[PDB]
Each structure stands twice: as structure tokens, then as C-alpha cells.
Symmetry: C4
């Protein structure tokens, strides 16, 4: 990969490390909740997949006393990561001047 | 510390203001609406946060008689904030010129 | 103003055109289809709002016979509009180089 | 005919391919899972379509034993093709030099 691409891929692997924390905080941030849905560690990890993608389809969601910010803060980490990759994107068309000669 | 990175952070503060104003409006908007489901000041702010993300997740959602332009405002305000900060992101690729000179 | 802010602003009008025609097609597409829930005219236009700025919280679902293409194309139109204005966002950092000369 | 529009448009052409592959997977993925929703085959493509546009809307949902990476793979596929188009889009501030020159 190129320099700027490795920087993007480095960011992608950072997000995966947040999902781990998300899976844990998820079970804690529901065991005690008023109308809790998310229970069990081995399905909590699956909830943490369907969030950091910036797609919150539903399924399970944390409540209130749980610190609803548990979902919020995980989702926002994905925004940072998939925003950062713009450092690759704004170079993608810059390649055209290289392609022009085949530099 | 830079120029653009300060203005990016200032945009985040704007979004928080809209959330807080949206929680006032949202409660009083829904008071009269059919379905509602969203009521009360202390959990109006909770609905407000994921509204700005445009994710929504699956907590609650507003009706028609609240004047759904309530949500439209908050949702579009979020997107424009997340967009503005590209003033910092779009200069990230440009850093690869600076590091070529090394100075 | 900058040339690409007027051009960006133009694009936002175009999105609102899609909403109009969406509101109309939506009632036809749903009214007659099995499983349909949209139906009424003034409640069609209010579904043709948030859908175009993605979200997903249209507060309704299309089915298959409506031609899910009716929702799909409205959502995609929003992407083209809000993505087109990226040309304005990209010249935001460029303004830095003017700052550094005070020009 | 603008090489960046060719590369951008070509990206969308692979998205369609992933939809067909993934819709085969999605229905066969869901089949076996507890609490399966997405059991339909000629409809599976319509769910796949809105999954690629990263919305979900509120039609169906995948379960656990589907291997919710089937759903997630379609989402990331959509993001990378559409985010690649940011090449052409991030070019469109640069076209302002030729605009300025008048030819």
C-alpha cells in the first residue's frame, strides 16, 4: 500500500479495538436497565458490530441509567476513523497528474 | 495550534447548542401530537443526541404534528457540522508535502 | 460569496424537487400495494423529508411492489446533493494559504 | 470524458455485483438462525439494496447465526465505492483554476 493508505488502514484497526470495549460496556450498560434488551456477552459482541459502521439498524440499544452515551461514544469513534481516511481520498484524484505521464 | 483545527472544534460546540434547544422544542412540539412517545425534558436530550447523528438507532422518533422540521433541523445541523470539520481533514493529505521538505 | 457556495446552494434546491415528486409517487406506489401503510396525501409529503437526508427514520417502510426504487432513488439523490457540495468544503482549508500572506 | 467520472462510475458497477452475491448469502445466512426475518429469496436483493446505501430503513434485520458480517460486508462495500467517488468530487474545487482562467 502507499504511505497515505497505510495511515488509513492503521485507523481501521483502531476502530476494531473500540468494538471490544463496546461489547463489554454493552453488557454492563444494560444489566440493571429499565426495559433492558441487550443481555449476554456472546450476543453483546454482535451488537457492537452493527453500530460503529454508522448504521444503527436497531436490534438492541442501551437505555438511560446505563449512560445512553455508551452507544453514542462507540458510534462517534467510527466517525473519527472513517473521516480520517479522507487523507487518502483527497489524493485519489491527485494521482491523475501522475497517470498523465505514467509517473 | 493551527487555525483550521480550532474552527473544527468550534463547530462541535454549535451542534451541542442545537441539541439543547432541540430538547426544549421537541418536548413542546410533541405535546399535542398523536403517537408522540417522546415526552419529558430529562429524556428529551437523550433522543436529541442520536437525532444529531442521524442514526436514531431505534430509541424513539417524532410524529408529524410536532412539525418534523424539528428533527430535520437537528439532523441537517449535525451533518453540516461533521462536514465543516473537513477543513481540517482536507489539509491532512497536504501534510505529505511538508514532510517531504522535512521542515 | 465564493462560486462554489452558490453552486452548493443550487444543489440543495434540487433535493427539494425530488421530495415533491417522491411525495406523489409514494402515495401511488403504496396505495394499492400489499402490506402498505403510507397511504394519505399530507402524510406522504412528511415521509418525503428525512428519507432524503438518509436517516432511515422515514417513520414508514415501503414494501416491494411500490418499487423500493421510489425510496432508493430519493435517498441516493440526497447523497449526490450533499456529496456535490464537498467541492465547497474542500476549498475551506485552501483559504489558509491566503491567511498566511494576509491576502 | 473526465477519467474521474469513469473510475467513479466503475465503482458503482461493482456495488451491484456485491448486492447479487450478498443477497444469495443473506437469505441462506438467515435460514438456520433463530428469529429469522429475512427468509425470502427474490425479495433478498431489495433488502441488500438498502443495506448498501447504509440506511436499513426499518424493513428487516439480520440475526446472529447469519454471520452478521454478511450484512456488515454489504455496508462496507457501499461505503468504499461511494467514498471512492470523493476523488471526482474533491477534484471539483481544483477545476476552479480552469474556471478562473476562462478556458
Amino acid at each position: 500500500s502507499a504511505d497515505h493508505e497505510r495511515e488509513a488502514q492503521k485507523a481501521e484497526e483502531e476502530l476494531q479495538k473500540v468494538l471490544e470495549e463496546a461489547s463489554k460496556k454493552a453488557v454492563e450498560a444494560e444489566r440493571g436497565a429499565p426495559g433492558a434488551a441487550l443481555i449476554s456477552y456472546p450476543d453483546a459482541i454482535w451488537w457492537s458490530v452493527e453500530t460503529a459502521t454508522t448504521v444503527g439498524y436497531g436490534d438492541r440499544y442501551p437505555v438511560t441509567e446505563e449512560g445512553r452515551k455508551v452507544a453514542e461514544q462507540v458510534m462517534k469513534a467510527g466517525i473519527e476513523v472513517f473521516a480520517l481516511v479522507t487523507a487518502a481520498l483527497a489524493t485519489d484524484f491527485v494521482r491523475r497528474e501522475e497517470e498523465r505521464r505514467g509517473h
